[PDB]
Coordinates of C-alpha atoms in Angstrom, one line a residue:
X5 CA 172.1 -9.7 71.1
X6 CA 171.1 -10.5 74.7
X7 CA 167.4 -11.7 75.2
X8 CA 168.5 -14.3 73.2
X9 CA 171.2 -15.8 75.2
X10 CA 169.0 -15.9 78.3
X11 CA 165.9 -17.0 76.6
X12 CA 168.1 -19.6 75.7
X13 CA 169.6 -20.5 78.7
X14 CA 166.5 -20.4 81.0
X15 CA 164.2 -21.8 78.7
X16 CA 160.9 -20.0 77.8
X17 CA 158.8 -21.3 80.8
X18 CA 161.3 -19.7 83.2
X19 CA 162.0 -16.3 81.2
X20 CA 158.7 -16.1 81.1
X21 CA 158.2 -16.1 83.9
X22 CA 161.3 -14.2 85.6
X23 CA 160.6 -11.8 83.3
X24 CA 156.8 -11.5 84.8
X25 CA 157.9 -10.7 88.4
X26 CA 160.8 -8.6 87.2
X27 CA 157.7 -6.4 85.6
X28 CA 155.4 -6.6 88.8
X29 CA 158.5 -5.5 90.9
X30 CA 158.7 -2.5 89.2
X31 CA 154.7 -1.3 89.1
X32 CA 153.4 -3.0 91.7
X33 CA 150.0 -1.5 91.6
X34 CA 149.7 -2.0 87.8
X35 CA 147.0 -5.1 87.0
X36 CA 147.4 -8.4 86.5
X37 CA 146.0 -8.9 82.5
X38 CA 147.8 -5.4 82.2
X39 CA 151.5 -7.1 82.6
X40 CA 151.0 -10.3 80.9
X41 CA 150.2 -9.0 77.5
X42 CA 153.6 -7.2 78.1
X43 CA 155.3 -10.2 78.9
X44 CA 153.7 -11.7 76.4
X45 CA 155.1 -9.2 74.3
X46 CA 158.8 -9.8 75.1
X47 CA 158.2 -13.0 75.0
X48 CA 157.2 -13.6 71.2
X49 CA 160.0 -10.2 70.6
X50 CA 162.8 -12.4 72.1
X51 CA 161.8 -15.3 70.1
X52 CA 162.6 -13.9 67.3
X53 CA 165.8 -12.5 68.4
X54 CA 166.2 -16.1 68.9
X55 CA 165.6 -17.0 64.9
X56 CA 167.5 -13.7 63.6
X57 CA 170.4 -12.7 66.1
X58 CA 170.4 -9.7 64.2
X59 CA 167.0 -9.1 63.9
X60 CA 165.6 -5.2 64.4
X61 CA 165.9 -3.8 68.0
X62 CA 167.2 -7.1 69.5
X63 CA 170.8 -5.3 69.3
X64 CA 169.3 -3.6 72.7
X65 CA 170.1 -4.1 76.7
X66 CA 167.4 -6.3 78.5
X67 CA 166.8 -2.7 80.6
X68 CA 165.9 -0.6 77.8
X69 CA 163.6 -3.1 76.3
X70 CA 162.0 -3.5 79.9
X71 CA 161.4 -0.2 80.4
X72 CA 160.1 0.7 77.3
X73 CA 157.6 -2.1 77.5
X74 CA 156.7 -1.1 80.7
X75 CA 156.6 3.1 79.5
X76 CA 153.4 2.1 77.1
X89 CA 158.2 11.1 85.2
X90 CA 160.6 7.4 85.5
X91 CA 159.7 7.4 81.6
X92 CA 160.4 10.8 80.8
X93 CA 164.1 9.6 81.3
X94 CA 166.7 7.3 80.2
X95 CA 169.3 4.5 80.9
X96 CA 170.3 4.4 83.2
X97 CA 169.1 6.9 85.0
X98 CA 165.3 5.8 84.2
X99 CA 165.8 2.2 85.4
X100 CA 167.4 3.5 89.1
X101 CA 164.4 5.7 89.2
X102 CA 161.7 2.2 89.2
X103 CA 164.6 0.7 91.1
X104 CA 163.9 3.7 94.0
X105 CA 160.2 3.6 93.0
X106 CA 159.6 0.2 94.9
X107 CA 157.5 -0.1 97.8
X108 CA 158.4 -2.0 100.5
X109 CA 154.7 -2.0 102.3
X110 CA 151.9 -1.1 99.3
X111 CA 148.6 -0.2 100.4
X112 CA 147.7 -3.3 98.4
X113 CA 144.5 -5.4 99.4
X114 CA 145.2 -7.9 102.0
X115 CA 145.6 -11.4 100.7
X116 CA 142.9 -13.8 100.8
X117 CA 142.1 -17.2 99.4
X118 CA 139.1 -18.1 98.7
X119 CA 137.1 -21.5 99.3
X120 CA 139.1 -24.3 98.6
X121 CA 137.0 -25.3 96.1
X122 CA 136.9 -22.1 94.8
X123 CA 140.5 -22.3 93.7
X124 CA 140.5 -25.9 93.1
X125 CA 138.0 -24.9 89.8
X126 CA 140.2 -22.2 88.6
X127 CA 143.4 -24.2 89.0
X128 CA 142.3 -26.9 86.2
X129 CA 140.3 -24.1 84.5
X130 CA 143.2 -22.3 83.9
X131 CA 146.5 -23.9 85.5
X132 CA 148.9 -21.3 83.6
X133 CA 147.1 -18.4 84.4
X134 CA 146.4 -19.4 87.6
X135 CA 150.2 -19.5 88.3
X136 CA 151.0 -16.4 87.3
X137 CA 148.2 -15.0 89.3
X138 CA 150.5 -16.4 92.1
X139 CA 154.0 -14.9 91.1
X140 CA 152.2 -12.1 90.3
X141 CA 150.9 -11.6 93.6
X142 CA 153.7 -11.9 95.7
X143 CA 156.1 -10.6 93.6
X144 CA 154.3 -6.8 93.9
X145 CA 153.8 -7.5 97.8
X146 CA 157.9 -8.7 97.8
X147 CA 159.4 -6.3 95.8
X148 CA 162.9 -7.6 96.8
X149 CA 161.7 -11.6 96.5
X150 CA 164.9 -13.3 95.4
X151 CA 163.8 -14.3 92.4
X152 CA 165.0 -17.8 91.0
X153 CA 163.8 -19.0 94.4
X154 CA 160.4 -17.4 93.8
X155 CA 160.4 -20.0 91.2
X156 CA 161.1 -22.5 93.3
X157 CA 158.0 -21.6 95.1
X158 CA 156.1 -21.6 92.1
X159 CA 156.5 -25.2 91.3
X160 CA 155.9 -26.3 95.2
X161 CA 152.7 -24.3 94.7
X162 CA 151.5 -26.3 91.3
X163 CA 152.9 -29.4 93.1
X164 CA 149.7 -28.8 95.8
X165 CA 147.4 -27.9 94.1
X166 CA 147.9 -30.9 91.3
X167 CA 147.8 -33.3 94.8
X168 CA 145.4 -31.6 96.9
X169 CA 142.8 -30.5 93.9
X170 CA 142.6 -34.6 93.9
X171 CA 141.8 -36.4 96.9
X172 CA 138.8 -36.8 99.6
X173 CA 140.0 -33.9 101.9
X174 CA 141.5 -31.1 99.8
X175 CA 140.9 -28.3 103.1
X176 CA 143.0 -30.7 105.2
X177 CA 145.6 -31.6 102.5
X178 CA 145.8 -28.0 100.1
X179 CA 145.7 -25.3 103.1
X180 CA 148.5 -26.5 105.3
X181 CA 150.9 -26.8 102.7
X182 CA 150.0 -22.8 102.1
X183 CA 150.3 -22.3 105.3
X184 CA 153.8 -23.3 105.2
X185 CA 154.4 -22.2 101.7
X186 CA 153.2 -18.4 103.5
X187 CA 155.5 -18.8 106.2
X188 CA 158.3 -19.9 104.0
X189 CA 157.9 -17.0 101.5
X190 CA 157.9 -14.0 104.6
X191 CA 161.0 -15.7 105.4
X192 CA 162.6 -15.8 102.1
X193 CA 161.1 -12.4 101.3
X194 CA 163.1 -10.9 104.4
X195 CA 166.1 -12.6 104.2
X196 CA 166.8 -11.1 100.8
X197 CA 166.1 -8.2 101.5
X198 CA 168.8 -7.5 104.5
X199 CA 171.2 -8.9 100.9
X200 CA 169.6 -6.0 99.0
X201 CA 169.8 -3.7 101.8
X202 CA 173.3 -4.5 102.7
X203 CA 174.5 -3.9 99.0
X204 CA 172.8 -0.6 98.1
X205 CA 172.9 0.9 101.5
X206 CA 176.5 -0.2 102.7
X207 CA 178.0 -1.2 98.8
X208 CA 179.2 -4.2 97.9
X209 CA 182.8 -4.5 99.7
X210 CA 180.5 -4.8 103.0
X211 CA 178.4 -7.9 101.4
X212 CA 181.9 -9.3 100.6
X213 CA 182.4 -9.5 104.2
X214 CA 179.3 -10.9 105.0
X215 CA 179.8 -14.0 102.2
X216 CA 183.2 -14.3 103.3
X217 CA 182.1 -15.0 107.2
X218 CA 178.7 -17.0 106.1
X219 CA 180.8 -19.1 103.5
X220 CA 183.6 -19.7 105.1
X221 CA 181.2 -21.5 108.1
X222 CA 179.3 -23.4 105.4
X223 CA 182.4 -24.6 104.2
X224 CA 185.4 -24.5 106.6
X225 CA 187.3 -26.9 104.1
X226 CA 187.5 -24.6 101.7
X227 CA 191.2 -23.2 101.0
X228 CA 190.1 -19.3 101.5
X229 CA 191.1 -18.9 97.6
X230 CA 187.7 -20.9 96.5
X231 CA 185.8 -19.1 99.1
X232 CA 186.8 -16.3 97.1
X233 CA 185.9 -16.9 94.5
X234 CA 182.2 -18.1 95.6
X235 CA 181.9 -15.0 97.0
X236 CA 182.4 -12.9 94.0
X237 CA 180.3 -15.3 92.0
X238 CA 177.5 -15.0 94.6
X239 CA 177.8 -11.2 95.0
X240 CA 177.3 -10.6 91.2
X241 CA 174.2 -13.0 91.8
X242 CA 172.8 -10.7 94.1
X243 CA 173.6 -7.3 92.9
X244 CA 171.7 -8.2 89.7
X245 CA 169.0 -9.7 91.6
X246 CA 169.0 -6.9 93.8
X247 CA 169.8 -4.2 90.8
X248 CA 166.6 -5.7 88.9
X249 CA 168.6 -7.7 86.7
X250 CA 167.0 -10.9 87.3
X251 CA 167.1 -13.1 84.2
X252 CA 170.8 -12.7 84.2
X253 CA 170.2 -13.2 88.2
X254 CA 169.0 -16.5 87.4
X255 CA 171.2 -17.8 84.5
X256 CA 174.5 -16.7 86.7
X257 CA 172.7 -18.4 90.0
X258 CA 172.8 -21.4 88.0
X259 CA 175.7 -21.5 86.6
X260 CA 176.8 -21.1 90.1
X261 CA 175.2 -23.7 91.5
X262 CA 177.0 -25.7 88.4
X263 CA 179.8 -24.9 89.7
X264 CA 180.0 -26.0 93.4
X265 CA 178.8 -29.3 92.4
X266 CA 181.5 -30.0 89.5
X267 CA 183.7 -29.1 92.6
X268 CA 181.7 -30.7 95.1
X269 CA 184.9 -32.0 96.8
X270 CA 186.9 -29.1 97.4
X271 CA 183.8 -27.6 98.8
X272 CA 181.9 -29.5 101.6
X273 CA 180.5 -33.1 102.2
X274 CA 177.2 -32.1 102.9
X275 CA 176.4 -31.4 99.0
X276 CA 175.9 -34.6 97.8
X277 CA 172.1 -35.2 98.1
X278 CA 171.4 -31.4 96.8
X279 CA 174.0 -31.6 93.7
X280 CA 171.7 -34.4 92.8
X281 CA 168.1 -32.9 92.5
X282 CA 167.1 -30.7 89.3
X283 CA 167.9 -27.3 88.7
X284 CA 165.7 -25.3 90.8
X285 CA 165.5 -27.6 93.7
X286 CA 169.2 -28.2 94.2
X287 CA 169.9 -23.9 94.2
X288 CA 167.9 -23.4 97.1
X289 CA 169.1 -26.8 98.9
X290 CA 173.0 -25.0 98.1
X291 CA 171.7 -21.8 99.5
X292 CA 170.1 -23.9 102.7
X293 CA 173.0 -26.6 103.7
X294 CA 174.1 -27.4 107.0
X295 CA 177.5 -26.6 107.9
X296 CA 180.6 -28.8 106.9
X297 CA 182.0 -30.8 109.9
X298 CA 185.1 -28.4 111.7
X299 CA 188.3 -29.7 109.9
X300 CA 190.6 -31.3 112.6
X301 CA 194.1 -29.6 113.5
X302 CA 193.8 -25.9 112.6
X303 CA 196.8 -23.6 113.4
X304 CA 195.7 -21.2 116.4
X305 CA 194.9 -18.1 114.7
X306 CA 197.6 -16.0 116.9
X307 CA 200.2 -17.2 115.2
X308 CA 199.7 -15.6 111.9
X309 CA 197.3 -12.4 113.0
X310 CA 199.1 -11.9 116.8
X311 CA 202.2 -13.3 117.3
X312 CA 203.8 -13.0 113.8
X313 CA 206.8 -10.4 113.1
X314 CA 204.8 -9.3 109.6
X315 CA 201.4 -8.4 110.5
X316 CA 202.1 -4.9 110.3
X317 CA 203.6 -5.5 107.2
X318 CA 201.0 -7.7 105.4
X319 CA 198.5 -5.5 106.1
X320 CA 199.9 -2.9 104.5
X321 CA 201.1 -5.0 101.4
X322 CA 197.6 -6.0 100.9
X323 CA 195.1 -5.3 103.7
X324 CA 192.1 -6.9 102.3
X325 CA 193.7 -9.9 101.2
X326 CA 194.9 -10.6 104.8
X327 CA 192.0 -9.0 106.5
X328 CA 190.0 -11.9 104.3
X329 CA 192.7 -14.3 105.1
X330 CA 191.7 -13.4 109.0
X331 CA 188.0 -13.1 108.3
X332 CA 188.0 -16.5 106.9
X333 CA 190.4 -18.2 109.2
X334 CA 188.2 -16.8 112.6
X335 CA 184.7 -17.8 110.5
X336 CA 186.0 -21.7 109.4
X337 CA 186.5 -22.1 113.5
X338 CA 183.7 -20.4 114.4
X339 CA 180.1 -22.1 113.4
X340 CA 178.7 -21.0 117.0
X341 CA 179.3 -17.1 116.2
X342 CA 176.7 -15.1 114.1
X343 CA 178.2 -13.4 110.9
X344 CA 177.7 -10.0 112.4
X345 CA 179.5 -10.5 115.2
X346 CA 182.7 -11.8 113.1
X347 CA 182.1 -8.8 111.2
X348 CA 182.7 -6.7 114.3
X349 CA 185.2 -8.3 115.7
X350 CA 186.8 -8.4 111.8
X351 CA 186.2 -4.7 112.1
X352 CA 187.7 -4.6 115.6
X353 CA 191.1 -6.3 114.6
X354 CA 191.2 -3.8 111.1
X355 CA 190.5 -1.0 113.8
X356 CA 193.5 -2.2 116.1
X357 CA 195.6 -2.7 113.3
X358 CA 195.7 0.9 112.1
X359 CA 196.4 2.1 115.5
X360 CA 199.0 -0.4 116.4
X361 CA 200.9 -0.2 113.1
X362 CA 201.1 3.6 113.3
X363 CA 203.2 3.1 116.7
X364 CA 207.0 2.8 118.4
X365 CA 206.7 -0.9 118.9
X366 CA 203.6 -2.4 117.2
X367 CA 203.8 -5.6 117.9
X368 CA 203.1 -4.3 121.9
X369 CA 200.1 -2.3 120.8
X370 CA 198.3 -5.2 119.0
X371 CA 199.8 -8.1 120.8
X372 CA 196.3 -8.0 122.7
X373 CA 193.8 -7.5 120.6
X374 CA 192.1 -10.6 121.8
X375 CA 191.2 -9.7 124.9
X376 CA 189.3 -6.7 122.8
X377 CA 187.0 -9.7 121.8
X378 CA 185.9 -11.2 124.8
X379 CA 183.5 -8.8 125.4
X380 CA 181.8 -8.2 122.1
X381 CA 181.5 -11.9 121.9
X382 CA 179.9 -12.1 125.7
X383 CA 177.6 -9.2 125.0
X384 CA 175.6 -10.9 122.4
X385 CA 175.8 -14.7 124.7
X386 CA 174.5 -13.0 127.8
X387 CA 171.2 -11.4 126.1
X388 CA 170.6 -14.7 124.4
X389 CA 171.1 -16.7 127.5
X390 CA 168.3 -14.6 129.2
X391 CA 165.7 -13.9 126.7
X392 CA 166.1 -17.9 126.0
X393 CA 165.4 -18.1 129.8
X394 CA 162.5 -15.9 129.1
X395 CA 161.0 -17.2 126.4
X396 CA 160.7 -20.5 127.7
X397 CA 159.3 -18.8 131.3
X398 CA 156.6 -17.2 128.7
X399 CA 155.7 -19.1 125.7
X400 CA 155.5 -17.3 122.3
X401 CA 152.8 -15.2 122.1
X402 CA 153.3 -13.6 125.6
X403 CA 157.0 -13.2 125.1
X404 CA 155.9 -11.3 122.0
X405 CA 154.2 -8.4 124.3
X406 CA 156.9 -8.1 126.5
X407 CA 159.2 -7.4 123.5
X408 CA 156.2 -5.1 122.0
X409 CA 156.2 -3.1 125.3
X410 CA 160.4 -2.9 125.2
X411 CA 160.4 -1.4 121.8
X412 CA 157.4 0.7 122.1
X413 CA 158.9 2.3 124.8
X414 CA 162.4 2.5 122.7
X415 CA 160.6 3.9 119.7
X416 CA 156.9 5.1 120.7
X417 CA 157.3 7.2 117.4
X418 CA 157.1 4.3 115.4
X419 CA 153.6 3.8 113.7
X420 CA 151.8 0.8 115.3
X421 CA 151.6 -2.0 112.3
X422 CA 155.3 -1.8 111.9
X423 CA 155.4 -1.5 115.9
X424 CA 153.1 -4.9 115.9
X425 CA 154.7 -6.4 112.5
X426 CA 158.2 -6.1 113.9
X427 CA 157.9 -7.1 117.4
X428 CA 155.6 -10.4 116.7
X429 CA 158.3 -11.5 114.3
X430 CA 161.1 -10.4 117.3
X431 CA 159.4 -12.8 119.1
X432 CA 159.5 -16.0 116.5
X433 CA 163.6 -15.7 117.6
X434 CA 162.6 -17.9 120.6
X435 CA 160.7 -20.5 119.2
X436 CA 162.9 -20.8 115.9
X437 CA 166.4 -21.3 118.3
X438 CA 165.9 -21.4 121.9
X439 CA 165.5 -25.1 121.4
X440 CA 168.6 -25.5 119.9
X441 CA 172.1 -26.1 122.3
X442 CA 173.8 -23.0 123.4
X443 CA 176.7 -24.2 120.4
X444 CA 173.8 -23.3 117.7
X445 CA 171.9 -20.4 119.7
X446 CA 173.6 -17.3 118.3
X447 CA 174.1 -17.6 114.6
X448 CA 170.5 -18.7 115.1
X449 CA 169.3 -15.7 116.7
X450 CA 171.0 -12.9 116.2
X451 CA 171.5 -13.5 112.4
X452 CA 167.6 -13.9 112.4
X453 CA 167.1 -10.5 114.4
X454 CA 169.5 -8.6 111.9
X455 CA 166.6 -10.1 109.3
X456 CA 163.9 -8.2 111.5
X457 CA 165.9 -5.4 112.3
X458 CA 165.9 -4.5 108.5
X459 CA 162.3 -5.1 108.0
X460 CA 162.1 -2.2 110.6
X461 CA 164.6 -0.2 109.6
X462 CA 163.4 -0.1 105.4
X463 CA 159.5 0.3 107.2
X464 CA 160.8 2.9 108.7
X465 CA 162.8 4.0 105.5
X466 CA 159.7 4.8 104.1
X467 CA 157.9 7.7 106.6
X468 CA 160.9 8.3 108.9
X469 CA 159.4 9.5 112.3
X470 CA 162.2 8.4 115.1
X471 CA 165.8 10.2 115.1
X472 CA 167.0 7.1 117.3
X473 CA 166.0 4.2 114.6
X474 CA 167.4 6.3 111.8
X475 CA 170.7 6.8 113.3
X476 CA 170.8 2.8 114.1
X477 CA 169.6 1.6 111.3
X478 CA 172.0 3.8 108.7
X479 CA 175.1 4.3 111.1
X480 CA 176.3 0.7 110.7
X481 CA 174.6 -2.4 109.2
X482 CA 176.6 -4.8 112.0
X483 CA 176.2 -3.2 115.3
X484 CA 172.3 -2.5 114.6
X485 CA 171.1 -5.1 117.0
X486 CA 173.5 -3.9 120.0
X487 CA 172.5 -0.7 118.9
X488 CA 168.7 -1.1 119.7
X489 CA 169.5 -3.4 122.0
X490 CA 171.1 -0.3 124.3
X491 CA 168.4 1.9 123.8
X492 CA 166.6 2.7 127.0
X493 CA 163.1 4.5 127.2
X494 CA 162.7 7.5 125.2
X495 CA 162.0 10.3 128.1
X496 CA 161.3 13.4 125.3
X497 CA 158.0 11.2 123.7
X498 CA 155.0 12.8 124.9
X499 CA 152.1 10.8 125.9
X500 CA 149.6 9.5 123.2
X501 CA 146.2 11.0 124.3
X513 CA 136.1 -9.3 116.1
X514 CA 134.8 -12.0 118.0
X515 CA 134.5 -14.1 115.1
X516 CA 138.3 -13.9 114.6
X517 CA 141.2 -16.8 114.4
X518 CA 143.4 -17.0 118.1
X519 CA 146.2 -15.2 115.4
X520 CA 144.1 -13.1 114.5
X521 CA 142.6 -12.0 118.1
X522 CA 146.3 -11.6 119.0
X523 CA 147.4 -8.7 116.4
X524 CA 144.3 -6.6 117.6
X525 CA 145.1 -7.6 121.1
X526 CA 148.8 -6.3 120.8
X527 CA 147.3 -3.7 118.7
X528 CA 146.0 -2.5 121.5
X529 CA 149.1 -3.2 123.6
X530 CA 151.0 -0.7 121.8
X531 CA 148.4 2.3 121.9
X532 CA 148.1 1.4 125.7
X533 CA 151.9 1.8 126.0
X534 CA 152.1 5.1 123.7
X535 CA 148.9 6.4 126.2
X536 CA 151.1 6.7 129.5
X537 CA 155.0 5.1 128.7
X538 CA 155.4 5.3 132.5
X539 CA 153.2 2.5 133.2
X540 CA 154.3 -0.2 135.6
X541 CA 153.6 -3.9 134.4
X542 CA 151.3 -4.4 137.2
X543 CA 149.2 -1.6 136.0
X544 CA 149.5 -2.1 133.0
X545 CA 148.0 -6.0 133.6
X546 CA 145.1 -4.2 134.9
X547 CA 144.0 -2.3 132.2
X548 CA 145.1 -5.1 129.5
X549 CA 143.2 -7.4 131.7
X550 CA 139.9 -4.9 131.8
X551 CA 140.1 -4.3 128.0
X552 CA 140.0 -8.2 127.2
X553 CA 137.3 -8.7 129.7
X554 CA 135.3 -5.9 127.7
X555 CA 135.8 -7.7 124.9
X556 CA 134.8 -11.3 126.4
X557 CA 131.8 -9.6 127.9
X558 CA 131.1 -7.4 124.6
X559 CA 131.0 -10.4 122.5
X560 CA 128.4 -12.4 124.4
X561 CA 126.0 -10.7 122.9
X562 CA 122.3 -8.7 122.6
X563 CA 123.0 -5.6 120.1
X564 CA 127.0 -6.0 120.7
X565 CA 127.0 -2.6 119.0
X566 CA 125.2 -0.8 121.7
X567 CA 127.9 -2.8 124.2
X568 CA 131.0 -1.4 122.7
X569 CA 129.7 1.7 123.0
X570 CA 132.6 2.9 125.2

């Protein structure tokens, strides 16, 4: 039997609680009361799995017991073909409620009244609203959010001690939330030998001490983590994230420096310090690559003895020396080098045709320095928010077929780039940024999934998950769009109906010129300043 060896190994709280979010994943809209009993359910069911091994129906797969719990057109079929239909039946963007917390004392009575129920409340309602949330780490973010509310329910101030721990626990979440989904996306949209890659180069710069034949390793180990998290097989996501995170400590050495302090927290804790690390210092005298991928007689032949093995071999040795380079532009210049290879290989004297395949570098690696460089310069000569309009305004005008929200959504969190690396050194700058932008990127391009409306994004987003950001990036004004024909609000709040606006003003006459495009922002906010004053404000905005 199965549910038994994972109720086992995670321990009730935790199944009971994977197996809560798995559930609310998959019906998103379904209540709250609704899925516990179901839980609930499992729950007692596993148990006694867990006293008879072969007891009655425990002989099933975790799937089928799932989605027969949840059953009581997806329904009217079978494994496996029923549990890829819930699997396609997720919503990135449900017209859910928004979010809102009431007083603080509000929750602070519920939270003793009921601290279990209370919890799951929380799981629950992210999970639904995340659909991809990487799970174990959801947990993680569970027990921060008791840890507040056990604090902050008990002192003088609990507004000034509770809220800004949710305020960062928010933040946190989106982050986490995104950054798994670009892993989920990556694996079911571009299969799994293309998230290999992407391990490979991350890895390899977390741990440039690593002999490539560990890194490996990690990398399968980590890709089946994700694949099941990502295929909806989270318990087992969990148990084999764990036993992952086992492992690189029993190996610590072999591995990186950095380790030590995580390795020594509990189980939850140390998995998400792993996954966050700072990179292991560059290990001294490293052969030039040349050598081996340039210079060498057997290139040609090693590649064709066993491409991926050496292509890996490269991948690695170009990532381990390169902690200043985002992932995706390794990737491309990985794919770049394969490319050359094949071309090369197939001539009179290969050696000659690949012997500069460097130089083939230099400019997808200036490409992405230049644009940083400036939009750095920018940011800084802007602040935040306004730097978030003028990207607005860029992409508006790139995709004014895009629906506003995602318009909005996208391009305020295109603009959290500068703020979250510019202040780093150049040395730090692009892995920072660009990695982060392939985050927002996706979050457009799965939006967009959803109600395609823009040729252009489509063919970015699905022609190639590594030159996405180049590929927006080159996009110049679409010329075939045709022309579009509260007071008592937070200063973040004022600024997403001021951008709002910013974007219907854009998709009203695309050939608008900054200056007058000032003025009529400018007029607009004065209405509003004017407007809220006061008398019958009503009767003001009339207009």
């Amino acid at each position: 039997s199965e549910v038994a060896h994972r109720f086992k190994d995670l321990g009730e709280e935790n199944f009971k609680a994977l197996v809560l979010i798995a559930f609310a994943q998959y019906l998103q809209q379904c209540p709250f009361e609704d899925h516990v009993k179901l839980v609930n359910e499992v729950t007692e069911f596993a148990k006694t799995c867990v006293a008879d091994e072969s007891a009655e129906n425990c002989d099933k797969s975790l799937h089928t017991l799932f989605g027969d719990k949840l059953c009581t057109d997806c329904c009217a079929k079978q494994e496996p073909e029923r549990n890829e239909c819930f699997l396609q039946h997720k919503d990135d963007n449900p017209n859910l409620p928004r979010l809102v917390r009431p007083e603080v004392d509000v929750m602070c009575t519920a939270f003793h009244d009921n601290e279990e129920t209370f919890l799951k409340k929380y799981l629950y309602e992210i999970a639904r609203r995340h659909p991809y949330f990487y799970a174990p780490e959801l947990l993680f973010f569970a027990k921060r959010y008791k840890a507040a509310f056990t604090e902050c329910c008990q002192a003088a101030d609990k507004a000034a001690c509770l809220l800004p721990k949710l305020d960062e626990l928010r933040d946190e979440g989106k982050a986490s939330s995104a950054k798994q989904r670009l892993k989920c996306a990556s694996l079911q949209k571009f299969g799994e030998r293309a998230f290999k890659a992407w391990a490979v180069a991350r890895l390899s710069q977390r741990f440039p001490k690593a002999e490539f034949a560990e890194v490996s390793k990690l990398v399968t180990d980590l890709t089946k983590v994700h694949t099941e998290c990502c295929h909806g097989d989270l318990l087992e996501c969990a148990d084999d994230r764990a036993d992952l995170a086992k492992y690189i400590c029993e190996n610590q050495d072999s591995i990186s420096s950095k380790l030590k302090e995580c390795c020594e927290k509990p189980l939850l804790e140390k998995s998400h310090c792993i996954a966050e690390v700072e990179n292991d210092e560059m290990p001294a005298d490293l052969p030039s690559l040349a050598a081996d991928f340039v210079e060498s007689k057997d290139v040609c032949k090693n590649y064709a003895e066993a491409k991926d093995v050496f292509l890996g071999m490269f991948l690695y040795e170009y990532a381990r020396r390169h902690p200043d380079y985002s992932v995706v532009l390794l990737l491309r210049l990985a794919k770049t080098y394969e490319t050359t290879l094949e071309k090369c290989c197939a001539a009179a004297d290969p050696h000659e045709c690949y012997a500069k395949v460097f130089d083939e570098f230099k400019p997808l690696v200036e490409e992405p320095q230049n644009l940083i460089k400036q939009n750095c310069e920018l940011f800084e000569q802007l602040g935040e928010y306004k730097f978030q309009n003028a990207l607005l305004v860029r992409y508006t005008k790139k995709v004014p077929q895009v629906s506003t929200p995602t318009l909005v959504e996208v391009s305020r969190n295109l603009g959290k780039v500068g703020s979250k690396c510019c202040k780093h050194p150049e040395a730090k700058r692009m892995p920072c940024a660009e990695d982060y932008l392939s985050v927002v990127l996706n979050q457009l391009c799965v939006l967009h999934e959803k109600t395609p409306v823009s040729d252009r994004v489509t063919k970015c987003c699905t022609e190639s998950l590594v030159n996405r950001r180049p590929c927006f990036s080159a996009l110049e004004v679409d010329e075939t769009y045709v022309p579009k024909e509260i007071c008592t609000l937070s200063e973040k709040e004022r600024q997403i109906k001021k951008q709002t606006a910013l974007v219907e003003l854009v998709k009203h006459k695309p050939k608008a010129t900054k200056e007058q495009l000032k003025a009529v922002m400018d007029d607009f906010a004065a209405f509003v300043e004017k407007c809220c004053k006061a008398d019958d404000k009503e009767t003001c905005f009339a207009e």
